[PDB]
Amino acid sequence: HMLSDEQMQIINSLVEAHHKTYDDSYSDFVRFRPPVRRLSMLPHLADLVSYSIQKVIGFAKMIPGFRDLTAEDQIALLKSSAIEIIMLRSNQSFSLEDMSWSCGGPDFKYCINDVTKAGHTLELLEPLVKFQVGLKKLKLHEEEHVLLMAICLLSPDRPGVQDHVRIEALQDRLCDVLQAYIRIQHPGGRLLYAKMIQKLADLRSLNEEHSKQYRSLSFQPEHSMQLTPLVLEVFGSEVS
Amino acid sequence: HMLSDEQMQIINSLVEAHHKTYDDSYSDFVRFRPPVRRLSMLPHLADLVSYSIQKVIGFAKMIPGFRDLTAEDQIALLKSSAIEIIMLRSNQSFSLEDMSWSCGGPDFKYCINDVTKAGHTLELLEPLVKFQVGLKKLKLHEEEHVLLMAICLLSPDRPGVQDHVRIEALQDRLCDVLQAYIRIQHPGGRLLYAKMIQKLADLRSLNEEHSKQYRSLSFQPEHSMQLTPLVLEVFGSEVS
């Protein structure tokens, strides 16, 4: 009926890791190629995603146990889950009133039409926006938001992983913390854990659709030349 | 004592090719990652160089005979000479009064200190600035400026070329046009042709030094990740 010391330490280390890799000022966005409103938003959104990938890597390096994995498993987990963590962490800037991501200014307010001008279609953007709204309606505590990103990253059912038992044990330990936190600290969160696990399933569907549309984008050199080396490396099909 | 029709057609096609790939407004520069004044200028200057490489490719495709070469020779010539043509074409924005490149605004005014903040040292920048000033003092006609870029690009003594005789014949035809133009149309240009050929030798020295410093830049992933895919492909060591 209460969390242990080792479990609250996991929560503390995860919250601090998120505060160190997510800047609420969005002042770094001025360093991206500016937004233009064919595929006029691709340069800006490619820099946005690339920048966010660096943050997800920094967040991952501070998750307990992730750094003790082999370098190959760390890469396999990051490559398969990078786009999902980005969709997850972007809920912090998503607004139900605007149905868009607001990052401090009209130039950094991204709507559905802005992502279509980056080579993507509604068959990805409709479920994406439909994913952000119900995740926003869940009204997760920050402790639950960061736990869900950690659980998503430490998923064993991802291509390329070798130590299935070591990573599953990590993910199980994070799930028990999340269940216990919601039980003790979140009133009325009786149905919340199931709803959070369902969002992981939605992320797999969003991940599959993004990879399909990214492949078509990356097969045209006039578009793939607008991407960044980190985006090409992380979303690329190279296997270790 | 006068140029033929076939030679003035070469001049016309070269001048038009330069007017189609060099915009004097520099309005596209706002789309680069903004300049910051470690290696704070690398993102902006990498976008500047990458953008300029696309222009040099467009210029090359309109040189008479270049497009009839095999795709491999075109790539070999572009990869070895890209940085030289960029140094050549940048004289148009270089100013003796400022000893810098002015591209319409203080944010797009690049001095020697700005390039040091992109990973380069004075052993490249001192000869580079010493190359721009004497090239500016030559006071080339636009017909001579574009002929020199064409001659530089169609050099046979470059790694990877296979059809040595076909490209040398092209370069020889361009040199006869340049000699004849200076003879007939440039008063007092009696010593100019030799001075222009000497600048080609200086470009080889500037090219060697840039490749050395680029290699050190590209071997550190934290810096090579700030480059563009086109820069990595053109300056890369891949051989066809």
Binding site: Q54, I57, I75, K79, P229, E233, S240 | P221, S224
Partner: peptide, 11 residues
């Protein structure tokens, strides 16, 4: 081969 990832993943 995962050059940028390896660098970013180390200290």
């Amino acid at each position: 081969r995962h050059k940028i990832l390896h660098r970013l993943l180390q200290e």
